[PDB]
């Protein structure tokens, strides 16, 4: 099936050449123009909703963490709206916990330390207790990006043009040739800053306290289960002693809670907690190196003073 073949192949890394659809069309065995038209339908119809470069947030120089605020219900919604305003906050959730506001913040380099940003947020919203958790899912080196790389990332991060020549418009905008752009794009891919270019209910964050010589096996054990999506790990701290996170979903706490007790039983982990998503105030993805954050931070300094 052409649909199957195409759908499968646009999820593979799209190559850094001038006419990458010419190449995918060859590999798929159909005419280029027809490959293009087909792609449109798949994005027009929403089984793939976007096709874009995937950059590595930390190799871009973004520090990012999961933040938790302890807010009381009268002021929960006020604070939540304030969080969504931050252009570097990708997700925001209300969760079932002492800390009832959980969001993901990511901060560009050379502006502020992440901890400063959350400090001023909690200060502005008069939140007394907050958590700053750095987790990691389941050889590359950080070099600060030049201003050009930042512009490159800035304009390329959107939807990948479904045209015969998809790096040409980008290159025109950046006043360089395709060849010079692809040159830079390839180097960022070799450095892993650029990973690839591709198309891509009832919910809880389960948090667990696990000995470190078991977290990999435990993580892989949990990763095998339906209802479990991604697994993450962090260090333990006095403010938060859970070191293993597992994203869970189902039909309700019921369908969900049950899928928890089991894990707790089969691996004897009595230390855990279920933070259900009762509300989502945001689920968008951040634009890297947009000037809207830096300013937003100004408005914040400006505000506070």
Curated annotation (Swiss-Prot):
Effect of residue 195 to A: Does not affect didecarboxysiroheme production. Shows a reduced ability to bind the substrate analog Fe-URO III
Keyword Protein transport among UniProt keywords: no
SMART domains: HTH_ASNC
Result of altering residue 230 to A/S: Loss of activity. Abolishes binding of the substrate analog Fe-URO III
Catalytic activity: siroheme + 2 H(+) = 12,18-didecarboxysiroheme + 2 CO2
Active site residues per record: 91
Entry EC no(s): 4.1.1.111
Lyase as UniProt keyword: yes
The protein's annotated pathway: Porphyrin-containing compound metabolism
Lineage: superkingdom: Bacteria
Gene Ontology MF annotations: lyase activity
Keywords assigned by UniProt, alphabetized: Lyase
Annotated InterPro entries: AsnC_trans_reg2, HTH-Siroheme_Decarb, NirdL-like_HTH, Tscrpt_reg_AsnC-like, WH-like_DNA-bd_sf
Function noted in UniProt: Involved in heme d1 biosynthesis. Catalyzes the decarboxylation of siroheme into didecarboxysiroheme. Siroheme is probably decarboxylated to monodecarboxysiroheme, which is in turn decarboxylated to didecarboxysiroheme.
Further remark: H.thermophilus possesses the fused nirDL gene but lacks the genes encoding NirG and NirH.
PANTHER family reported for this sequence: SIROHEME DECARBOXYLASE NIRL SUBUNIT (PTHR43413:SF1), TRANSCRIPTIONAL REGULATOR, ASNC FAMILY (PTHR43413)
Family: Belongs to the Ahb/Nir family.
Name of the protein described by the UniProt record: Siroheme decarboxylase
Organism of derivation: Hydrogenobacter thermophilus (strain DSM 6534 / IAM 12695 / TK-6)
């Amino acid at each position: 099936n052409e649909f199957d073949k195409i759908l499968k192949i646009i999820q593979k890394d799209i190559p850094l050449v001038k006419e990458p659809f010419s190449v995918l069309a060859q590999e798929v065995g159909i005419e280029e123009g027809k490959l293009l038209k087909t792609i449109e339908k798949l994005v027009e119809d929403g089984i793939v909703r976007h096709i874009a470069p995937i950059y590595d947030s930390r190799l871009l120089g973004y520090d990012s963490a999961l933040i938790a605020f302890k807010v009381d219900r009268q002021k929960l919604e006020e604070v939540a709206n304030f969080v969504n305003a931050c252009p570097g906050v990708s997700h925001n959730y209300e969760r079932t916990h002492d800390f009832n506001l959980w969001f993901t913040l990511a901060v560009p380099p050379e502006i502020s330390e992440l901890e400063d940003v959350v400090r001023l947020m909690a200060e502005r919203e008069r939140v007394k207790d907050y958590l700053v958790l750095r987790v990691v899912r389941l050889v590359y080196t950080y070099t600060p990006l030049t201003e050009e790389e930042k512009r490159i990332v800035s304009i390329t991060q959107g939807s990948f043009p479904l045209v015969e020549r998809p790096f040409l418009e980008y290159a025109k905008r950046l006043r360089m040739s395709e060849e010079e752009l692809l040159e830079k794009l390839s180097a960022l891919k070799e450095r892993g800053v650029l990973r690839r270019i591709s198309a891509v209910v009832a919910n809880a964050m389960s948090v667990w306290e696990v000995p470190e010589d078991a977290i990999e096996e435990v993580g892989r054990y949990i990763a095998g289960f339906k209802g479990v999506s991604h697994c993450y790990q962090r260090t333990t701290s006095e403010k938060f002693r859970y070191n293993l996170f597992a994203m869970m979903h189902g039909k309700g706490q019921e369908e969900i809670k049950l899928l928890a007790e089991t894990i707790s039983r089969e691996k004897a982990l009595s230390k855990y907690a279920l933070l259900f998503s009762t509300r989502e105030f945001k689920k968008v993805r951040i634009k890297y190196f947009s000037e809207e954050f830096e300013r937003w931070f100004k408005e914040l300094i400006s505000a506070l003073e």
